Amino acid sequence: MPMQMFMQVYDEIQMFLLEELELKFDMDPNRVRYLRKMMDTTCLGGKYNRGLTVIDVAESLLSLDGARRKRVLHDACVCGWMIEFLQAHYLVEDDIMDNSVTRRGKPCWYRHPDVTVQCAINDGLLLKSWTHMMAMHFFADRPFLQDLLCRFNRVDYTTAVGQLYDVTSMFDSNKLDPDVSQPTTTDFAEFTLSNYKRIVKYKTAYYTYLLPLVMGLIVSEALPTVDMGVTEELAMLMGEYFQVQDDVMDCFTPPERLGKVGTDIQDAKCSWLAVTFLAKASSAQVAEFKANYGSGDSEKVATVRRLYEEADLQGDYVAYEAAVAEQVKELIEKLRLCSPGFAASVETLWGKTYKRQK
């Protein structure tokens, strides 16, 4: 049911956008077709957990003829897509920024045969503009419009900030200067857990966990009924854990099931495995690491992979995962004391995160 309704609204959104382009932007059939393909390829294919959560959080707060339910649930699907389209935008640019080859089993958007990298960058921009176009089209008369968009934009902004932290993590920040070049850090002094948590919090936690919950509460007109301090704590913790899983899979999950080929080591990324490894590594391990990380060379990539394996990072992950699970639990219980319906929707989201396989 959730997915069926969500997809019906997707076509409704697509039709509005595509036809408006034809009618008011003087767009030809060829480019409309291109944009329809671009939209489907960049927005469809995932598990839609960010978008579906909005619908689930909205439906579950429906208690605080059917008219209302129909409006609230449809507003929820629109918001769900706003987030899915926002993500799509970031993913298109991110793939370019991370030099990835595939995503969701297919080539990254900018690696498609008839898609130039220069056009891909702009298509990414179109994806984000669409979030605002659909928002105005469906919510122009809603009282929550301003607060809704004010929050959406702040999260958009925090994600861009996190991406800044992500792409500048392997460069000595003390030497960060637009006018003078510098190579990848060679002492990796900044690959610390503190720095890692900051990167992940802003680039993933906010738009992946907090925004779906907040938008769900807003279209449900129940925002004030929840402890926001606890909700944010929960979103931040679940968000970090999700990126950790993302980092681990990048290195150890086969691309067949992952749907995307990892580039974290190649890109010398400040991943969870890298910081956790470096924090426990002996002097010998650190030396060998430094001499193999950040290279495309296949053997040096398998050597970094072996190190992690030898330093029992898989064991470290299990420990961490268990510590997260207990905090989430104590936090959801705190939520439940005043927001039983909301806390249950949160449990569901957790169920889609805990030990996810993809």
Ligand X SMILES: O=P(O)(O)C(O)(C[n+]1cccc(F)c1)P(=O)(O)O
| Interface with Mg ion (CB under 5 A) | 94, 98, 246, 250
Q: Which stretch binds a copy of itself (CB under 8 A): 63-71, 166-174, 247-255, 282-290?
A: 166-174
Sign of CA dihedral 252, 95, 38, 2: positive
Nearer to ligand X, 74 or 260 (CB): 260
| Residue type (1 letter), 296 | G
Question: Is residue 96 within the footprint of a copy of itself (CB under 8 A)?
Answer: yes
Sign of CA dihedral 213, 218, 221, 224: positive
List the beta bridge partners of residue 103.
Answer: 106
Question: Is residue 132 within the footprint of a copy of itself (CB under 8 A)?
Answer: yes
- Identify whether the C-beta of residue 212 lies closer than 8 Å to the C-beta of residue 353: no
Question: Is residue 186 within the footprint of a copy of itself (CB under 8 A)?
Answer: no
Nearer to Mg ion, 53 or 266 (CB): 266
According to CB under 6 A, which one of 53, 60, 163, 345 is a site residue for ligand X?
A: 163
According to the annotation, is 98 in a ligand binding site? Answer: yes
List the beta bridge partners of residue 106.
Answer: 103
Question: Is residue 8 within the footprint of a copy of itself (CB under 8 A)?
Answer: no
- Identify whether the C-beta of residue 205 lies closer than 8 Å to the C-beta of residue 243: yes
Overall residue count recorded for the chain in this entry: 358
Q: Which stretch binds a copy of itself (CB under 8 A): 161-169, 237-245, 300-308, 326-334?
A: 161-169
Q: Which stretch binds ligand X (CB under 6 A): 71-79, 86-94, 125-133, 273-281?
A: 86-94
Question: Is residue 104 within the footprint of a copy of itself (CB under 8 A)?
Answer: no
| Binding-residue pattern over the window 188 to 217 for a copy of itself, x denoting contact by CB under 8 A | ----------x---x---------------
Structure tokens at 263: 């580039």
Question: Is residue 145 within the footprint of a copy of itself (CB under 8 A)?
Answer: yes
| Binding-residue pattern over the window 194 to 213 for ligand X, x denoting contact by CB under 6 A | ---------xx---------
Question: Is residue 169 within the footprint of a copy of itself (CB under 8 A)?
Answer: no
Closest CA to 258 of 155, 120, 104: 104
User: Rounded distance, CA 328 to CA 323, Å?
Assistant: 9
The secondary element (H helix, E strand) that includes residue 80 is helix 67-98
- Alpha carbon 7 to its chain centroid, in Å, reads 20
Of 228-287, binders to a copy of itself (CB under 8 A) are none
The alpha carbon torsion through 161, 95, 151, 213 (nearest 10 deg) reads -120
Annotated binding site for Mg(2+): which residue ranges? 94-95, 98, 166, 246, 250, 264
